[PDB]
Amino acid sequence: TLRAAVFDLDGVLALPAVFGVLGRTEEALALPRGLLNDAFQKGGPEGATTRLMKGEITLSQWIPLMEENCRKCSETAKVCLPKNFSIKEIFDKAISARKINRPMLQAALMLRKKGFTTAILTNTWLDDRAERDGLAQLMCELKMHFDFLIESCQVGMVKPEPQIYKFLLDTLKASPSEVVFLDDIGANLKPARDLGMVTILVQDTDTALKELEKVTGIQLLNTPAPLPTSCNPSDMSHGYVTVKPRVRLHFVELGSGPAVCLCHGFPESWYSWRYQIPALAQAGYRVLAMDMKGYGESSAPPEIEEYCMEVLCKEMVTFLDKLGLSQAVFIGHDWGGMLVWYMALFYPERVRAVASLNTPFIPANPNMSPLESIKANPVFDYQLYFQEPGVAEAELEQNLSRTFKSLFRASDESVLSMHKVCEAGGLFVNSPEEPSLSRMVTEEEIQFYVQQFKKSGFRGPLNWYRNMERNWKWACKSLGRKILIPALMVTAEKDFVLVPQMSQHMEDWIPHLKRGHIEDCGHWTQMDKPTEVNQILIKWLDSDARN
Amino acid sequence: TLRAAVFDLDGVLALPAVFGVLGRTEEALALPRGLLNDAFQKGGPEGATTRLMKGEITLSQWIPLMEENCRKCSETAKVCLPKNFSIKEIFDKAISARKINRPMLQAALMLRKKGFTTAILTNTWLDDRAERDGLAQLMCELKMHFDFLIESCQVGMVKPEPQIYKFLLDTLKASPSEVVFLDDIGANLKPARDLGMVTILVQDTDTALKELEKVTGIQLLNTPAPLPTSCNPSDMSHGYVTVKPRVRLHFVELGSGPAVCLCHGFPESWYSWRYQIPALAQAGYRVLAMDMKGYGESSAPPEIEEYCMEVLCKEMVTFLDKLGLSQAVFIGHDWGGMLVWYMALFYPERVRAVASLNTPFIPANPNMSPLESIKANPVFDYQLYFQEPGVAEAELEQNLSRTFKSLFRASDESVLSMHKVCEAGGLFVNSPEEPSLSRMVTEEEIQFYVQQFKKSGFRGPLNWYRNMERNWKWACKSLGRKILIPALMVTAEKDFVLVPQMSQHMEDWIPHLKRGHIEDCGHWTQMDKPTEVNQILIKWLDSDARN
Ligand SMILES: O=C(O)CCCCCNC(=O)NC1CCCCC1
Ligand SMILES: O=C(O)CCCCCNC(=O)NC1CCCCC1
Ligand SMILES: [Mg+2]
Ligand SMILES: [Mg+2]
């Protein structure tokens, strides 16, 4: 029967309620119970606070009008006011002290996820204070989670004016009955009922949620920890930079502050960071999820030489140049991690900080050649299978859907044996024609990769492996250097191709290296353990990057 | 005969020379003349500083090796060292104290402009100091002005090793003879001559320039103040954001820091900021030159309603949302300026600061209607000519090249009389079929606009004028508000459509409004007086925006 849920901002989706400061300020100052509340609502409909609530006057204009009402409310009550009594000072703390009621937001998100139209109905004001940005960020994080956001000072209407409620129904394109309205103020609830729609007086969150969980018939309370926000492609800013006459790199950009460049591995795309792009941004950073040369909307030239580390790095530097960025924090994974390590070893001046996921930094051996060193590792067998041009491409591009469904899998649901790849004569030789669905990705998420690789295919990516000798030589030039800039190495327990032990010596070359580890975590870190990853990176970013 | 110019970094393109600190530190500390210089070059070819110069070891690794040589150079010289003697501390100040030798850079730029292949040949090092970014920015600003940039620690070679010089010739794809090498060190010059190419020992800039001005036969010294850097389209990062299902805005992004959104006017494009995009970025900002809805690579739907201020602003807010930006400094011009004023009046929370060029903020008159108010102004006559759909489009899209060459003109070279436009029955009724070439734009710059408007045409732009009534009504809602956030109004003396006097009252609505004015400046501010504009905006940005 229900199909919509409307949440109030202050007191419901955000706490502590800004309206609640009035009372606290009173007791704290031992003022006549209500003295501040009265001056706040002096004039009812045709009152200053009402005007301010309808966008008639900015908040900075309201404050002075509010001060005077306190000089008269205290005058009639035969009382005074402290000498250090500042209305702005009071609301400033009150507003910045208001945080998102996480459990409530989660419940809202849940509803929407199970086919529900959410929306925020709040009596706000045009904030033009010198700290307005604070409130800005708040609403910025809440917006993206609700189908609608109706602001009083926006629509020129304010609760409980029955009109705005009509506006709501109209905006929700739904009849009252199929709507749930949550608010902490009773007055703002009556109207909702008078029109039909179910209401819920919100005092304490859990209680309200119970009523909600019931009236909606959907488990909201005591629910599992959900996955972090996963950005939607079509709603992302897409950027393009021409690094070379015939090489154009694509990237997804979100957030503001220190630039954090994310470099995915083989065979992925910028989408492999869908779980960290939002989080990192919200953390106060300018995430630049890349589309590494050869993948997605990035140029994918055939020439193998076009994919040797040296050239790859030079273009990344050019990328910084074209964008007007002196430095950048490089975070990689798989081949990406490899890329960032050499970004730090060859262009320190450009790296604010470097972080690798799974990929350990191992200095090339001046004596043994790559081919030899690789054959020395059974699990790297598959890398020999990637050498011959065409062979690997054939099998992988043969059935994209299968290819990705077979690769992107947890450590407990594998179906590919990198063991005797060459032996079997293929990567899928004994894999199902229609693998199950990895608990890490949905049917959709997979098809996204399918459509991407439909463009340039697997040639460009596979070339990253076809420059061992060159990459080797180039690296030998740095055997005398040392990573002395902020570095962080994150290891995956269940990664059976990039075992954590392969980095046990890293500190020898990277003295002040910090670390991270993720229990029961496969090779595809971002997908497998997105929460741990964000937590780990954000932690590291604030301590060693922001500086 | 000559066709190439190679400049050394330290001492030539940048001063004071970092190598020169050695001597100064000596005298300042009353140390044996050379004590520091010796320890610096102890070991010649197979020396620490040489290794550091060939990328064998990072700078942070070198410092310790340099310290010891001073503990031995002072030991043999029978002298000691102060207790607060720090090598890092000395080079830190020395490096950050090095600035771009402007007059030299200018001379280089001049050469290149007159068909010369420039390039930087310097013996640098991989900087991994905690202040590396400083050096990073320096080279970042120099790079873009030279065809090539050969770093010692990069190519593994170092001057005066005759090999690297060969590398140079090869990279310059030119024979010695047609090359000019400038350096402050004599030793680094001999090789150049031994191969042929002309050399110039650079002591004092003016002297070197004279020799250069001569040997090249091109006025370099005592030359006019040049125009600021004008970014090249193909070398800019292009971004796209979908604000609405069928509306996608395009923008050019450059720089890092506080986001500065530039909104052009009718009928331009993001290219109208070609002179401020670089400058502002270099000033420490993240410039986001826009492509206002209806222009260039931005969606241009036919529906007039699609261009009323309210919708235009809502999308700009959505633009911020999709990009993950809580706030942004909005700088507009012409219609753009109009847009930003209403961005501040309706979304203060989102505006870090607002600045308008030419366009004055005039609050709508509750009584008189737009149509009436406009007819009250002779010069606004043309605006009536834009009302009827199709008419205006016809004449303007008829000959793009002519249209833009007739519009974009200085205040002393006009050819269009907005006076009796309706009377004459056209905007070009009595204008030349092939106008001259405005001293503001080149033949090329013009064709860029031509190709842009070839896409969506003049329909979308012209619609900005076709929503007077709506824009009027909407604005009446803010008649009770006031711009109380950082604001800056820049007026153009010779603007005869947007006269400076039209803003004489602005302070009544914008109390703390700051101002700017530009002598003998036409309507197309950015093009006409780019230098003044940058100076003015950057000034305002650091004082009221960065905060
Ligand atoms: O666990 C599984 O079932 C499959 C894992 C497949 C990993 C592919 N990544 C890879 O080869 N990266 C290189 C990057 C450069 C260093 C060596 C590894
Ligand atoms: O000087 C010249 O020869 C030609 C100037 C042409 C100016 C066109 N700009 C314009 O109409 N802007 C509106 C923006 C909204 C307010 C009114 C002006
Ligand atoms: Mg409330
Ligand atoms: Mg020099």
Coordinates of C-alpha atoms in Angstrom, one line a residue, chain B residues 28-224:
Chain B
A28 CA 77.6 34.7 6.1
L29 CA 79.2 32.1 8.4
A30 CA 82.7 33.4 7.8
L31 CA 83.8 30.0 6.5
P32 CA 87.0 29.3 4.4
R33 CA 86.2 30.6 1.0
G34 CA 85.0 27.5 -0.9
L35 CA 84.7 25.2 2.1
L36 CA 81.1 24.5 1.2
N37 CA 81.6 24.6 -2.6
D38 CA 84.4 21.9 -2.3
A39 CA 82.4 19.5 -0.2
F40 CA 79.7 20.0 -2.8
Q41 CA 81.8 18.9 -5.7
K42 CA 84.1 16.4 -3.8
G43 CA 84.6 13.4 -6.0
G44 CA 84.2 15.0 -9.5
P45 CA 82.7 12.5 -12.0
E46 CA 82.3 9.7 -9.5
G47 CA 81.0 12.0 -6.8
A48 CA 77.8 12.0 -4.7
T49 CA 76.5 15.2 -6.3
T50 CA 77.2 13.8 -9.7
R51 CA 75.2 10.6 -8.9
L52 CA 72.4 12.8 -7.5
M53 CA 72.5 14.7 -10.8
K54 CA 72.1 11.5 -12.8
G55 CA 69.2 10.2 -10.9
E56 CA 71.3 7.5 -9.2
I57 CA 70.1 8.7 -5.8
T58 CA 67.3 11.0 -4.6
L59 CA 68.1 14.4 -3.0
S60 CA 67.0 13.2 0.4
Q61 CA 69.7 10.5 0.1
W62 CA 72.3 13.1 -1.1
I63 CA 72.0 15.5 1.8
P64 CA 73.5 13.1 4.3
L65 CA 76.4 12.3 1.9
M66 CA 76.9 16.1 1.5
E67 CA 77.0 16.7 5.2
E68 CA 79.9 14.3 5.7
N69 CA 82.0 15.9 3.0
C70 CA 81.6 19.2 5.0
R71 CA 82.8 17.4 8.1
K72 CA 85.9 16.5 6.2
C73 CA 86.4 19.6 4.0
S74 CA 86.4 21.6 7.2
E75 CA 88.6 19.0 8.9
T76 CA 91.4 19.3 6.3
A77 CA 91.0 23.1 6.2
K78 CA 91.5 23.1 10.0
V79 CA 88.1 24.6 10.7
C80 CA 84.8 23.6 12.2
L81 CA 81.1 24.3 11.6
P82 CA 78.3 26.1 13.5
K83 CA 76.1 23.9 15.8
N84 CA 73.0 25.0 13.8
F85 CA 74.5 24.2 10.4
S86 CA 71.9 22.2 8.4
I87 CA 72.5 21.3 4.8
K88 CA 68.8 20.6 4.3
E89 CA 68.0 23.9 6.0
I90 CA 70.4 25.7 3.6
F91 CA 69.1 24.2 0.3
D92 CA 65.5 24.5 1.5
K93 CA 65.7 28.3 1.7
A94 CA 67.9 28.4 -1.3
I95 CA 65.5 26.5 -3.5
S96 CA 62.3 28.2 -2.4
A97 CA 64.2 31.5 -2.8
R98 CA 64.6 30.7 -6.5
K99 CA 62.1 32.4 -8.8
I100 CA 61.5 32.5 -12.5
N101 CA 63.7 35.1 -14.3
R102 CA 60.7 36.7 -15.9
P103 CA 62.6 38.9 -18.4
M104 CA 64.5 35.8 -19.6
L105 CA 61.4 33.6 -19.8
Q106 CA 59.7 36.4 -21.8
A107 CA 62.7 36.5 -24.2
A108 CA 62.4 32.7 -24.6
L109 CA 58.7 32.9 -25.3
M110 CA 59.3 35.7 -27.8
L111 CA 61.7 33.5 -29.8
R112 CA 59.4 30.6 -29.8
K113 CA 56.6 32.8 -31.0
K114 CA 58.6 34.0 -33.9
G115 CA 59.3 30.4 -35.1
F116 CA 61.9 29.1 -32.7
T117 CA 62.3 25.7 -31.0
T118 CA 63.0 26.4 -27.3
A119 CA 64.1 23.8 -24.7
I120 CA 65.6 23.7 -21.2
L121 CA 68.8 21.9 -20.5
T122 CA 69.5 21.6 -16.8
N123 CA 71.4 19.4 -14.3
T124 CA 68.6 18.7 -11.9
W125 CA 67.8 16.1 -9.3
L126 CA 64.9 13.9 -8.2
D127 CA 63.4 16.1 -5.4
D128 CA 61.8 14.0 -2.6
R129 CA 62.1 16.6 0.2
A130 CA 59.0 17.3 2.3
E131 CA 58.9 20.6 0.3
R132 CA 59.4 19.0 -3.1
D133 CA 56.1 20.5 -4.3
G134 CA 57.7 23.9 -4.4
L135 CA 60.2 22.9 -7.0
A136 CA 57.3 21.0 -8.7
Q137 CA 55.2 24.1 -9.3
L138 CA 58.2 26.0 -10.6
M139 CA 58.9 23.4 -13.4
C140 CA 55.2 23.1 -13.9
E141 CA 55.0 26.8 -14.9
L142 CA 58.1 26.6 -17.0
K143 CA 57.4 23.4 -18.9
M144 CA 54.4 24.7 -20.9
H145 CA 56.5 27.5 -22.4
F146 CA 59.2 25.3 -23.9
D147 CA 59.1 22.7 -26.7
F148 CA 61.4 20.5 -24.6
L149 CA 62.7 20.1 -21.1
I150 CA 65.8 17.8 -20.7
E151 CA 66.6 17.0 -17.0
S152 CA 70.0 15.6 -16.1
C153 CA 68.6 13.1 -13.5
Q154 CA 66.1 12.1 -16.2
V155 CA 68.3 11.3 -19.2
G156 CA 71.0 9.8 -16.9
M157 CA 73.5 12.3 -18.4
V158 CA 74.9 15.6 -17.1
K159 CA 76.6 18.7 -18.4
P160 CA 79.3 19.1 -19.6
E161 CA 79.5 15.4 -20.6
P162 CA 79.6 15.8 -24.4
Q163 CA 77.2 12.9 -24.7
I164 CA 74.1 14.8 -23.4
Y165 CA 74.8 17.6 -25.8
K166 CA 74.6 15.1 -28.7
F167 CA 71.3 14.0 -27.1
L168 CA 70.2 17.6 -27.3
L169 CA 71.0 18.1 -31.0
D170 CA 69.1 14.8 -31.7
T171 CA 66.1 15.8 -29.6
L172 CA 66.1 19.3 -31.3
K173 CA 66.3 17.5 -34.7
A174 CA 68.7 20.3 -35.6
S175 CA 72.4 20.7 -36.4
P176 CA 74.6 22.6 -33.9
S177 CA 75.1 25.8 -36.0
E178 CA 71.3 26.6 -35.9
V179 CA 71.3 26.4 -32.1
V180 CA 71.8 28.9 -29.3
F181 CA 72.9 27.7 -25.8
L182 CA 72.7 29.9 -22.8
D183 CA 74.3 29.0 -19.5
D184 CA 75.9 30.8 -16.6
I185 CA 78.7 28.3 -16.3
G186 CA 81.6 28.5 -18.8
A187 CA 82.5 24.8 -18.5
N188 CA 79.0 23.9 -19.6
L189 CA 79.5 26.1 -22.7
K190 CA 82.8 24.9 -24.3
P191 CA 81.2 21.5 -25.4
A192 CA 78.4 23.4 -27.2
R193 CA 81.0 25.3 -29.2
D194 CA 83.1 22.3 -29.9
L195 CA 80.0 20.9 -31.7
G196 CA 79.3 24.2 -33.5
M197 CA 76.2 25.8 -31.9
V198 CA 76.5 29.4 -30.7
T199 CA 76.9 29.9 -27.0
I200 CA 76.3 32.8 -24.6
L201 CA 77.8 33.1 -21.1
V202 CA 75.0 34.4 -19.0
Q203 CA 76.1 36.7 -16.1
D204 CA 73.5 39.5 -15.9
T205 CA 70.3 39.0 -17.9
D206 CA 70.2 42.2 -19.9
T207 CA 73.7 41.7 -21.2
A208 CA 73.0 38.1 -22.2
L209 CA 69.8 39.2 -23.8
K210 CA 71.7 41.8 -25.8
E211 CA 74.0 39.2 -27.2
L212 CA 71.0 37.0 -27.8
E213 CA 68.9 39.8 -29.3
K214 CA 71.8 40.3 -31.7
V215 CA 72.9 36.7 -32.6
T216 CA 69.2 36.1 -33.2
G217 CA 68.3 39.4 -34.8
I218 CA 65.0 39.7 -33.0
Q219 CA 64.0 42.5 -30.6
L220 CA 64.0 40.8 -27.1
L221 CA 65.1 43.5 -24.8
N222 CA 63.0 46.6 -24.1
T223 CA 60.0 45.0 -25.7
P224 CA 56.3 45.8 -25.0

